[PDB]
Design a protein around this ligand. Structure first.
Ligand SMILES: [O][B]1([O])O[C]C2=C1[C]=C(N1[C]=C([C]OC3=[C][C]=C(F)[C]=[C]3)N=N1)[C]=[C]2
Ligand SMILES: [Zn+2]
Length: 256
């Protein structure tokens, strides 16, 4: 599977029939139809003890991986019951500034979308958590092109060292707090992985406030390669799944 005409989102259902399931992601967030839920709690994002390890080009995106063998970087509160440990973050982005996000807001596409991936500690490991309807909590953050994001530049600067599929680099001592906007106001809904195997295991928490990144920062994302070293060059761009039908779901807002 991939993001080409021949292996992209329109083809995934043949290997992963859940692609046409009842709680697929991403979705369009209709801001006028989302329901303010005054009983939703503030998010608790606790990243002060986060231990970043490595950055990997996996042929679909790049992952910044964390030590998830202890409660070092956790997400709690909001719609969540219990404790979710940060395992990795990655992005989805476009070939052009007017596309790249997976979620949309009133049909608006952002230049990119950050996914901070967390798993429910009551399931013991990530592999068990993805088999559960409440196994993952993904914090989604939109990127718009404007001012540079200083907290992103360490990521941008290392991408030269992981250009091709299967390359990795040390990525210790990275603080993911530098990727957050000021506000933790959010939308939430039950959904899925946006990539095969498209498992319906995710509580989505999408922040209302986008972060700003510079044109030069997102340009560097677009110089990555989907291919391995010594293969024909395929730029890693447009690694996003389009919005899927909402079906029998309500999107809830933490704010009025
Ligand atoms: O880009 B996204 O769609 O957005 C959100 C998101 C994405 C991919 C993952 N993700 C996939 C894998 C692969 O590991 C697996 C192991 C066992 C499985 F059964 C499935 C996957 N690891 N993290 C997690 C969260
Ligand atoms: Zn993702």
């Amino acid at each position: 599977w991939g993001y080409g005409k021949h292996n992209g989102p329109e083809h995934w259902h043949k290997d992963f029939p859940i692609a046409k399931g009842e709680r697929q992601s991403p979705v369009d967030i209709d801001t006028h139809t989302a329901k303010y839920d005054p009983s939703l709690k503030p998010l608790s994002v606790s990243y002060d003890q986060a231990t970043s390890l490595r950055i990997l080009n996996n042929g679909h995106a790049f992952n910044v991986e964390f030590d998830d063998s202890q409660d070092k970087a956790v997400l709690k509160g909001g719609p969540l019951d219990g404790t979710y440990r940060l395992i990795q973050f990655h992005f989805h982005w476009g070939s052009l500034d007017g596309q790249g996000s997976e979620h949309t807001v009133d049909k608006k596409k952002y230049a990119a979308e950050l996914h901070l991936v967390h798993w429910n500690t009551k399931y013991g490991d990530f592999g068990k958590a993805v088999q559960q309807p409440d196994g993952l909590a993904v914090l989604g953050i939109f990127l718009k092109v404007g001012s540079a994001k200083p907290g992103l530049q360490k990521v941008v600067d290392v991408l030269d060292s992981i250009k091709t599929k299967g390359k990795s680099a040390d990525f210790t001592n990275f603080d993911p707090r530098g990727l957050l906007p000021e506000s933790l106001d959010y939308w939430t809904y039950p959904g899925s992985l946006t990539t095969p195997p498209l498992l319906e295991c995710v509580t989505w928490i999408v922040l209302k406030e986008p972060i700003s990144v510079s044109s030069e920062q997102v340009l560097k994302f677009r110089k990555l390669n989907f291919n391995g070293e010594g293969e024909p060059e395929e730029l890693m761009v447009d690694n996003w799944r389009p919005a899927q039908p909402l079906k029998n779901r309500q999107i809830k807002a933490s704010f009025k």
